[PDB]
Design a binder for this molecule. Structure first.
Ligand SMILES: C[C@H]1O[C@H](O[C@H]2CC[C@H](n3ccc(NC(=O)c4ccc(NC(=O)[C@@](C)(N)CO)cc4)nc3=O)O[C@@H]2C)[C@H](O)[C@@H](O)[C@@H]1N(C)C
Ligand SMILES: NC(=[NH2+])NCCC[C@H](N)C(=O)O
Ligand SMILES: [Mg+2]
Ligand SMILES: [Mg+2]
Ligand SMILES: [Mg+2]
Ligand SMILES: [Mg+2]
Ligand SMILES: [Mg+2]
Ligand SMILES: [Mg+2]
Ligand SMILES: [Mg+2]
Ligand SMILES: [Mg+2]
Ligand SMILES: [Mg+2]
Ligand SMILES: [Mg+2]
Ligand SMILES: [Mg+2]
Ligand SMILES: [Mg+2]
Ligand SMILES: [Mg+2]
Ligand SMILES: [Mg+2]
Ligand SMILES: [Mg+2]
Ligand SMILES: [Mg+2]
Ligand SMILES: [Mg+2]
Ligand SMILES: [Mg+2]
Ligand SMILES: [Mg+2]
Ligand SMILES: [Mg+2]
Ligand SMILES: [Mg+2]
Ligand SMILES: [Mg+2]
Ligand SMILES: [Mg+2]
Ligand SMILES: [Mg+2]
Ligand SMILES: [Mg+2]
Ligand SMILES: [Mg+2]
Ligand SMILES: [Mg+2]
Ligand SMILES: [Mg+2]
Ligand SMILES: [Mg+2]
Ligand SMILES: [Mg+2]
Ligand SMILES: [Mg+2]
Ligand SMILES: [Mg+2]
Ligand SMILES: [Mg+2]
Ligand SMILES: [Mg+2]
Ligand SMILES: [Mg+2]
Ligand SMILES: [Mg+2]
Ligand SMILES: [Mg+2]
Ligand SMILES: [Mg+2]
Ligand SMILES: [Mg+2]
Ligand SMILES: [Mg+2]
Ligand SMILES: [Mg+2]
Ligand SMILES: [Mg+2]
Ligand SMILES: [Mg+2]
Ligand SMILES: [Mg+2]
Ligand SMILES: [Mg+2]
Ligand SMILES: [Mg+2]
Ligand SMILES: [Mg+2]
Ligand SMILES: [Mg+2]
Ligand SMILES: [Mg+2]
Ligand SMILES: [Mg+2]
Ligand SMILES: [Mg+2]
Ligand SMILES: [Mg+2]
Ligand SMILES: [Mg+2]
Ligand SMILES: [Mg+2]
Ligand SMILES: [Mg+2]
Ligand SMILES: [Mg+2]
Ligand SMILES: [Mg+2]
Ligand SMILES: [Mg+2]
Ligand SMILES: [Mg+2]
Ligand SMILES: [Mg+2]
Ligand SMILES: [Mg+2]
Ligand SMILES: [Mg+2]
Ligand SMILES: [Mg+2]
Ligand SMILES: [Mg+2]
Ligand SMILES: [Mg+2]
Ligand SMILES: [Mg+2]
Ligand SMILES: [Mg+2]
Ligand SMILES: [Mg+2]
Ligand SMILES: [Mg+2]
Ligand SMILES: [Mg+2]
Ligand SMILES: [Mg+2]
Ligand SMILES: [Mg+2]
Ligand SMILES: [Mg+2]
Ligand SMILES: [Mg+2]
Ligand SMILES: [Mg+2]
Ligand SMILES: [Mg+2]
Ligand SMILES: [Mg+2]
Ligand SMILES: [Mg+2]
Ligand SMILES: [Mg+2]
Ligand SMILES: [Mg+2]
Ligand SMILES: [Mg+2]
Ligand SMILES: [Mg+2]
Ligand SMILES: [Mg+2]
Ligand SMILES: [Mg+2]
Ligand SMILES: [Mg+2]
Ligand SMILES: [Mg+2]
Ligand SMILES: [Mg+2]
Ligand SMILES: [Mg+2]
Ligand SMILES: [Mg+2]
Ligand SMILES: [Mg+2]
Ligand SMILES: [Mg+2]
Ligand SMILES: [Mg+2]
Ligand SMILES: [Mg+2]
Ligand SMILES: [Mg+2]
Ligand SMILES: [Mg+2]
Ligand SMILES: [Mg+2]
Ligand SMILES: [Mg+2]
Ligand SMILES: [Mg+2]
Ligand SMILES: [Mg+2]
Ligand SMILES: [Mg+2]
Ligand SMILES: [Mg+2]
Ligand SMILES: [Mg+2]
Ligand SMILES: [Mg+2]
Ligand SMILES: [Mg+2]
Ligand SMILES: [Mg+2]
Ligand SMILES: [Mg+2]
Ligand SMILES: [Mg+2]
Ligand SMILES: [Mg+2]
Ligand SMILES: [Mg+2]
Ligand SMILES: [Mg+2]
Ligand SMILES: [Mg+2]
Ligand SMILES: [Mg+2]
Ligand SMILES: [Mg+2]
Ligand SMILES: [Mg+2]
Ligand SMILES: [Mg+2]
Ligand SMILES: [Mg+2]
Ligand SMILES: [Mg+2]
Ligand SMILES: [Mg+2]
Ligand SMILES: [Mg+2]
Ligand SMILES: [Mg+2]
Ligand SMILES: [Mg+2]
Ligand SMILES: [Mg+2]
Ligand SMILES: [Mg+2]
Ligand SMILES: [Mg+2]
Ligand SMILES: [Mg+2]
Ligand SMILES: [Mg+2]
Ligand SMILES: [Mg+2]
Ligand SMILES: [Mg+2]
Ligand SMILES: [Mg+2]
Ligand SMILES: [Mg+2]
Ligand SMILES: [Mg+2]
Ligand SMILES: [Mg+2]
Ligand SMILES: [Mg+2]
Ligand SMILES: [Mg+2]
Ligand SMILES: [Mg+2]
Ligand SMILES: [Mg+2]
Ligand SMILES: [Mg+2]
Ligand SMILES: [Mg+2]
Ligand SMILES: [Mg+2]
Ligand SMILES: [Mg+2]
Ligand SMILES: [Mg+2]
Ligand SMILES: [Mg+2]
Ligand SMILES: [Mg+2]
Ligand SMILES: [Mg+2]
Ligand SMILES: [Mg+2]
Ligand SMILES: [Mg+2]
Ligand SMILES: [Mg+2]
Ligand SMILES: [Mg+2]
Ligand SMILES: [Mg+2]
Ligand SMILES: [Mg+2]
Ligand SMILES: [Mg+2]
Ligand SMILES: [Mg+2]
Ligand SMILES: [Mg+2]
Ligand SMILES: [Mg+2]
Ligand SMILES: [Mg+2]
Ligand SMILES: [Mg+2]
Ligand SMILES: [Mg+2]
Ligand SMILES: [Mg+2]
Ligand SMILES: [Mg+2]
Ligand SMILES: [Mg+2]
Ligand SMILES: [Mg+2]
Ligand SMILES: [Mg+2]
Ligand SMILES: [Mg+2]
Ligand SMILES: [Mg+2]
Ligand SMILES: [Mg+2]
Ligand SMILES: [Mg+2]
Ligand SMILES: [Mg+2]
Ligand SMILES: [Mg+2]
Ligand SMILES: [Mg+2]
Ligand SMILES: [Mg+2]
Ligand SMILES: [Mg+2]
Ligand SMILES: [Mg+2]
Ligand SMILES: [Mg+2]
Ligand SMILES: [Mg+2]
Ligand SMILES: [Mg+2]
Ligand SMILES: [Mg+2]
Lengths: 203, 77, 110, 59, 141
RNA sequence: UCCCCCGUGCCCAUAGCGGCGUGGAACCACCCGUUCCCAUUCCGAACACGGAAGUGAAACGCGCCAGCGCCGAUGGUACUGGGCGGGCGACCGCCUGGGAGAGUAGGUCGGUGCGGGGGA
RNA sequence: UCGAUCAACGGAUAAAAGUUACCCCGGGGAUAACAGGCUGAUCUCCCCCGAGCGUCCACAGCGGCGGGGAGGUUUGGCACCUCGAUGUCGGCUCGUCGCAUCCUGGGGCUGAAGAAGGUCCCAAGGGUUGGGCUGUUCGCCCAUUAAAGCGGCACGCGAGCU
RNA sequence: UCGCCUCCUAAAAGGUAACGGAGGCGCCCAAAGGUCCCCUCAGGCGGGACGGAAAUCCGCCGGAGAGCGCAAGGGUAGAAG
RNA sequence: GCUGACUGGGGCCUGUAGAGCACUGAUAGGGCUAGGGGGCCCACCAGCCUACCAAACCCUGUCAAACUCCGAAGGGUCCCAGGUGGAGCCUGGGAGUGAGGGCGCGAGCGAUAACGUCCGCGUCCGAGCGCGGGAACAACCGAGACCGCCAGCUAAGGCCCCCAAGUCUGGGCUAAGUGGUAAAGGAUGUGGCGCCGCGAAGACAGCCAGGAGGUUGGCUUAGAAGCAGCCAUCCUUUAAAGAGUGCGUAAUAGCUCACUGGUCGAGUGGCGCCGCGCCGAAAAUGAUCGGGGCUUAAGCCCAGCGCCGAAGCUGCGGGUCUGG
């Protein structure tokens, strides 16, 4: 889809306070411009949880602008698991590479058998025209068995969308479950103590 | 119990002994190295132990020629 | 990936320059043989000599001397006496050789 | 311009080098004020001890 | 329980546990996960303890990912002995863990099944844990 | 002072792998021979001598394409010299100066010195 | 130019191993054995988690694999006062304190019918036998008991005895 | 265990301890020295009598991962091979 | 005789922190795919399927003192300049020291123990056991004591009383004497900030009723009747109502949840972040935060004015040494 969000510029302000002022430092940047922005961390949160790096977001800049863009990158406070910076990509009418989501429709056979669907990729990288952004990409996963797998090759691509990866890429798989029965045997598991790489005249 | 390591060698004082823009005479040492981490540029020699040493009373100078290595020169006066 | 032609060219020449003397470069084509004396510290050439630009005949060997004798002739005028002989990827033999034999006659010292 | 430097905290307990700065400037006592030209060199040490000194721009 | 299969050097030093997680702070595979709020040397004994706890709360099913591995050799002298006389012998391996790192993930299972099992897997850890969900923040990584 | 070529240096891949196309008047290369100088741990492939019927297929040169490789900001974070704080600890934070790496947007199928041959 | 496991490799002699509870002297708490001290790996007791047992039922009684603490009675680590001396096991005598309570008292739960038990909680006032073996602490055993508790005081107590 | 060498610890000059973690020397070469000329490896794919996962030959790819008598290090094909 | 520590500019050397995976090795999962284990099918030599142990290779995600495609802050040294200091260079005489210790940061060893040990930069005590603060204490905070004063200003630390100066001013938090020693963990403790539902299409509490038949349902077993594991979520009457939330049971049943009819008439039930507090919390001569004692504090956080407070600074006088 396409959401919206106010974005205001910055410069001499210092990211320390901002993010304590409740605002998330950020930058707008394509091949033509490059400006430093900042957003009400809360407001943008309510969007990115819905948008991610998938759906379009036009910034309602205070100058009067209102540019279409996508998020190329989000930097997070590893310790506190929180965002500390964002990159909005000035989306122009040119062909672009972006991650398009995936919705795996159909209940795989393995699931019915006890396996699990390891949704390896949850979105796909693709070149496209922003005007031609799909919402999402269906994929049938009904005929999957433990432990069959699925690739970008087996994707059925809509118009104007073109993979930006090697079809040999994998994007899903049905794998066996966690089974207690495997435990007890795993307990009496004997593992020969680690071998140390010989050195010197011992090779 | 007991150990089987506990042995080592006397550090050799390796490195550079005269830096760029530094004034030397004929015969001084410019780099003490293992291998040819540097190379003999101009007015500079190298001995059987990759030891670089000035060849005239000049002024030291380095030069990073990329893939070709890092050379030490001696422009006279 | 270099070629035995490329390599042999370097080692013969990287060694020469270590003497810091003027370098007599010789090129050997199927038809003509050329020769320019170079100064690899100023990156510039001085006196040139080639069969081609000398309207020279057939005997490649006898030619080499005339380009040799000639090159030395124009050199000494510019006060160029000593010099180093670059045989490049070419072994000191015949054309390449005979040339140097001429230059040595013209006055050049090597 | 010129700088008036006053030694307000004791170097007793800071590295030998900083004690040398107070020497460079000329500060050998507490509260001691010393007015100095405003070159970069002077303005260098003076900054090395600004956790010990109170600075003021004069004339 | 985990440990390498082959090693260059028998004994590592001790390093340190200063700073936030170098990497692994973000859900990569499974749906939910277990994050580290404070550092430690987490022992394969510990890991296996979490693991088995979750696999058994899943009874049959589920999928557990272990995003930390005990590759640090943990050494200790014999018993009652003196100081010196070489370095201690190895007695098990540990997994260095620093705050914000995702130690375990899970998939193919409800919500009040991963939440629980993770809570139980968290009580087998010498540190504090934080149960997390997959955020688009994760996906943009 | 301009464009094509043979030589030879410089920066040291923004210059390379690869795919395509193009050049033979000149020069360059494959070329025609192995009598002669010279030569293969066998081979005139290589080096080398004498040639000048042919071809630019191979190699080299000059140009387009971003699949790989290389290069790569801005903003932010990690870390940090110096100066202060917190916790019993593992450890955690603030101020002043410095400030990465990975990643993003992008850039790149080279630039220039000298002397030769031809051309306008 | 040669003769070097002068390898204890700056190499006392050309030439050399042991024992001392018969021992001596000069020095050291610069250095061990006792004890104390800092630490708390080991030791003692307490807890988090709740897989699994208990016909049924996780938690009456139990607690896999793991996690976090307290205490300073064990074995040790360090080697901090003491080697111009701080005498070290056990016992006898005499106590006194702690409470993680052996007994008596008061409670909850109980797979508590009752009687009698089990398990946590409150409580340190008083009590907690006599013997056989052994130097023994401890432990085993006989006869009993309301019960025959564990520990600190330099493993309390030799200018108080042995 | 005791001298010598290599790497780390060593906190981005040198130097830096511990009965700290890992390995080596007490030789060797008459060529494995000097100089001139020439040559370039492992490795992957396909190809071939005996003939093989690796004997040697042919082809393409292959900036160096082979090699340098020996431990390790740095260095190194534009050579030190 | 200005060359000194320290400082400003500039050039060169480096490979740590941090990080990265291109080399060396380690690494969980998946993909691709030589090589075996095992099932059919075979001795005729070849085929086929694998929820099986797995090489190389790619992908997502990591690890390393003895790994580095990268790579700091700093450090080191050379030149110019500042720097006149119990600074430096040189020659010469006399020594003592060659048993260090605490602290801080970086490591190793140790158990991510020790008033432990062994190195590195620094600092202090040593020699400042002279002074102020820290209840008391060589090394933590402050500060380098020539001597004298019944003078003044300050540092750390402090201002209710012991005990010099505020029972000072403003806002907030705490009810535990937390303050005035400890962790996992546990809890409707209290306060501030947010989020999802449900609610006058009348909620939550309570009230009132209902809550129903196939159906004591099936793989199912020895009890398995909604509530001991699965490979299960199908119909009916309907106002509504899981073939079921839980309690309950040996297994029947009852109890209520989700569920709608009635009753009142406004909010309620469940998450997560921060602040301060509770339990968790057992040791031995007599108790205590240094004491008394303190609760819109005499405690904690944030913001201010003023004072007390050293052998530091000033002020007056004096001594000696060195320089002018
Ligand atoms: C009988 C003799 O008695 C007397 O001499 C004795 C006096 C004592 C001395 N001794 C004795 C013992 C010892 N230590 C150890 O055994 C030891 C034990 C354990 C550990 N444990 C650890 O390290 C742990 C814990 N970390 C674990 O690893 C370390 C060291 N050290 C000694 O010095 O021995 C002498 C000869 C007479 O004078 C003599 O006439 C007579 N006879 C010669 C006629
Ligand atoms: N400028 C500096 N060197 N700062 C060091 C700060 C170190 C401090 N522990 C921190 O993490 O922030
Ligand atoms: Mg969209
Ligand atoms: Mg938020
Ligand atoms: Mg040994
Ligand atoms: Mg050693
Ligand atoms: Mg050593
Ligand atoms: Mg050493
Ligand atoms: Mg060394
Ligand atoms: Mg150097
Ligand atoms: Mg030499
Ligand atoms: Mg040599
Ligand atoms: Mg330069
Ligand atoms: Mg020069
Ligand atoms: Mg040039
Ligand atoms: Mg001070
Ligand atoms: Mg101080
Ligand atoms: Mg400095
Ligand atoms: Mg003073
Ligand atoms: Mg001041
Ligand atoms: Mg590390
Ligand atoms: Mg541990
Ligand atoms: Mg150890
Ligand atoms: Mg040791
Ligand atoms: Mg262990
Ligand atoms: Mg980690
Ligand atoms: Mg825990
Ligand atoms: Mg990443
Ligand atoms: Mg063509
Ligand atoms: Mg072409
Ligand atoms: Mg033609
Ligand atoms: Mg003839
Ligand atoms: Mg031929
Ligand atoms: Mg040829
Ligand atoms: Mg011809
Ligand atoms: Mg062509
Ligand atoms: Mg060629
Ligand atoms: Mg060219
Ligand atoms: Mg282009
Ligand atoms: Mg980059
Ligand atoms: Mg930047
Ligand atoms: Mg600092
Ligand atoms: Mg502190
Ligand atoms: Mg920080
Ligand atoms: Mg800055
Ligand atoms: Mg960068
Ligand atoms: Mg290119
Ligand atoms: Mg021209
Ligand atoms: Mg002799
Ligand atoms: Mg030996
Ligand atoms: Mg000796
Ligand atoms: Mg001897
Ligand atoms: Mg020596
Ligand atoms: Mg002798
Ligand atoms: Mg002897
Ligand atoms: Mg005797
Ligand atoms: Mg005897
Ligand atoms: Mg006797
Ligand atoms: Mg006698
Ligand atoms: Mg006798
Ligand atoms: Mg006697
Ligand atoms: Mg004796
Ligand atoms: Mg005596
Ligand atoms: Mg001693
Ligand atoms: Mg002593
Ligand atoms: Mg002793
Ligand atoms: Mg003792
Ligand atoms: Mg004892
Ligand atoms: Mg005693
Ligand atoms: Mg003792
Ligand atoms: Mg005592
Ligand atoms: Mg004592
Ligand atoms: Mg103690
Ligand atoms: Mg303790
Ligand atoms: Mg407890
Ligand atoms: Mg049972
Ligand atoms: Mg029960
Ligand atoms: Mg329990
Ligand atoms: Mg247990
Ligand atoms: Mg523990
Ligand atoms: Mg003890
Ligand atoms: Mg002692
Ligand atoms: Mg004494
Ligand atoms: Mg004594
Ligand atoms: Mg006495
Ligand atoms: Mg005495
Ligand atoms: Mg009690
Ligand atoms: Mg009782
Ligand atoms: Mg009772
Ligand atoms: Mg009964
Ligand atoms: Mg009964
Ligand atoms: Mg009873
Ligand atoms: Mg009872
Ligand atoms: Mg009592
Ligand atoms: Mg009693
Ligand atoms: Mg008795
Ligand atoms: Mg008797
Ligand atoms: Mg006994
Ligand atoms: Mg017995
Ligand atoms: Mg009785
Ligand atoms: Mg009783
Ligand atoms: Mg004892
Ligand atoms: Mg004892
Ligand atoms: Mg005693
Ligand atoms: Mg006694
Ligand atoms: Mg006696
Ligand atoms: Mg006695
Ligand atoms: Mg070093
Ligand atoms: Mg260093
Ligand atoms: Mg030196
Ligand atoms: Mg030793
Ligand atoms: Mg050895
Ligand atoms: Mg050799
Ligand atoms: Mg064959
Ligand atoms: Mg090699
Ligand atoms: Mg070897
Ligand atoms: Mg290297
Ligand atoms: Mg001067
Ligand atoms: Mg100087
Ligand atoms: Mg200087
Ligand atoms: Mg210095
Ligand atoms: Mg400087
Ligand atoms: Mg690191
Ligand atoms: Mg790697
Ligand atoms: Mg990667
Ligand atoms: Mg690392
Ligand atoms: Mg290292
Ligand atoms: Mg490293
Ligand atoms: Mg770079
Ligand atoms: Mg630098
Ligand atoms: Mg100056
Ligand atoms: Mg003077
Ligand atoms: Mg002095
Ligand atoms: Mg002095
Ligand atoms: Mg003297
Ligand atoms: Mg000594
Ligand atoms: Mg000592
Ligand atoms: Mg002494
Ligand atoms: Mg000493
Ligand atoms: Mg020391
Ligand atoms: Mg010490
Ligand atoms: Mg002390
Ligand atoms: Mg310390
Ligand atoms: Mg600090
Ligand atoms: Mg530190
Ligand atoms: Mg440290
Ligand atoms: Mg170390
Ligand atoms: Mg350790
Ligand atoms: Mg310590
Ligand atoms: Mg000591
Ligand atoms: Mg020492
Ligand atoms: Mg002394
Ligand atoms: Mg002091
Ligand atoms: Mg002092
Ligand atoms: Mg003091
Ligand atoms: Mg005193
Ligand atoms: Mg005294
Ligand atoms: Mg004091
Ligand atoms: Mg005091
Ligand atoms: Mg006082
Ligand atoms: Mg002072
Ligand atoms: Mg005042
Ligand atoms: Mg007070
Ligand atoms: Mg009083
Ligand atoms: Mg008040
Ligand atoms: Mg107030
Ligand atoms: Mg209480
Ligand atoms: Mg209290
Ligand atoms: Mg908690
Ligand atoms: Mg808590
Ligand atoms: Mg609560
Ligand atoms: Mg209620
Ligand atoms: Mg059923
Ligand atoms: Mg408590
Ligand atoms: Mg008491
Ligand atoms: Mg004074
Ligand atoms: Mg006066
Ligand atoms: Mg004086």
């Amino acid at each position: 889809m396409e959401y919206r969000l106010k974005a205001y510029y910055r410069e001499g302000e210092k990211p320390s306070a901002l993010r304590r002022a409740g605002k998330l430092p950020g930058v707008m940047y394509n091949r033509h411009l490059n400006r430093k922005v900042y957003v009400d961390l809360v407001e943008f949160d309510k969007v990115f949880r819905q948008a991610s790096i998938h759906h379009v977001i036009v910034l309602e800049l205070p100058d009067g602008q209102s540019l279409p863009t996508l998020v190329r990158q989000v930097n997070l406070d590893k310790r506190r698991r929180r965002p500390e910076h964002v990159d909005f990509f000035v989306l122009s009418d040119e062909p672009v590479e972006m991650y398009v989501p995936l919705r795996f429709v159909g209940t795989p056979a393995g699931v019915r058998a006890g396996g699990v669907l390891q949704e390896i990729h949850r979105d796909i990288l693709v070149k496209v025209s922003p005007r031609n952004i799909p919402e999402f990409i269906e994929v049938d996963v009904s005929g999957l068995e433990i432990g069959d797998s699925l690739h970008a090759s087996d994707l059925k691509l809509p118009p104007g969308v073109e993979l930006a990866v090697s079809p040999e890429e994998t994007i899903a798989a049905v794998v066996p479950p966690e089974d207690v029965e495997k435990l007890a045997e795993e307990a009496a598991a004997e593992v020969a103590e680690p071998e140390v790489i010989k050195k010197g005249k011992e090779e | 119990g007991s150990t089987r390591n506990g042995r080592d060698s006397q550090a050799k004082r390796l490195g550079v002994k005269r830096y760029e823009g530094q004034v030397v005479r004929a015969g001084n040492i410019l780099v003490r190295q293992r291998g040819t981490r540097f190379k003999p540029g101009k007015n500079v020699g190298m001995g059987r132990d990759f030891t670089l040493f000035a060849l005239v009373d000049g002024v030291v100078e380095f030069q990073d020629r990329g893939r070709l290595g890092r050379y030490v020169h001696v422009r006279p006066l | 990936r270099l070629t035995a032609y490329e390599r042999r060219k370097f080692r013969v020449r990287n060694r020469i320059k270590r003497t810091g003397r003027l370098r007599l470069s010789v090129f050997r084509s199927l038809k003509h043989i050329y020769a320019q004396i170079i100064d690899d510290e100023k990156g510039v050439t001085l006196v040139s000599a080639s069969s081609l630009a000398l309207k020279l005949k057939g005997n490649k060997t006898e030619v080499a001397r005339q380009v040799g004798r000639a090159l030395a002739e124009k050199a000494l005028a510019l006060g160029i006496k000593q010099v180093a002989f670059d045989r490049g990827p070419y072994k000191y033999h015949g054309r390449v050789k005979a040339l140097a034999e001429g230059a040595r006659e013209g006055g050049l010292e090597f | 311009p010129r700088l008036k430097v006053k030694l307000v905290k004791s170097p007793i307990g800071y590295p030998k080098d900083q004690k040398a700065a107070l020497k460079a400037l000329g500060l050998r006592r507490l509260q001691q004020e010393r007015v100095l030209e405003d070159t970069p060199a002077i303005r260098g040490n003076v900054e090395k001890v600004a956790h010990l000194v109170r600075v003021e721009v004069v004339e | 329980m985990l440990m390498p299969r082959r090693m260059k050097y028998r004994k590592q030093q001790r390093g340190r546990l200063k700073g936030a997680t170098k990497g692994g702070d973000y859900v990569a595979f499974g749906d939910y996960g277990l994050v580290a709020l404070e550092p430690a040397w987490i022992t394969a004994q510990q890991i296996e303890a979490a693991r088995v706890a979750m696999v058994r709360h899943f009874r049959r099913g589920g999928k557990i990912f272990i995003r930390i591995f005990p590759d640090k050799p943990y050494t200790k002298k014999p018993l009652e002995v003196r100081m010196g006389k070489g370095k201690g012998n190895v007695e098990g391996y540990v997994a260095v863990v620093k705050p914000g790192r995702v130690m375990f993930e899970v998939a193919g299972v409800t919500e009040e099944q991963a939440m629980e099992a993770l809570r139980i897997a968290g009580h087998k850890l010498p540190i504090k844990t934080k149960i997390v969900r997959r955020d688009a923040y994760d996906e943009a990584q």
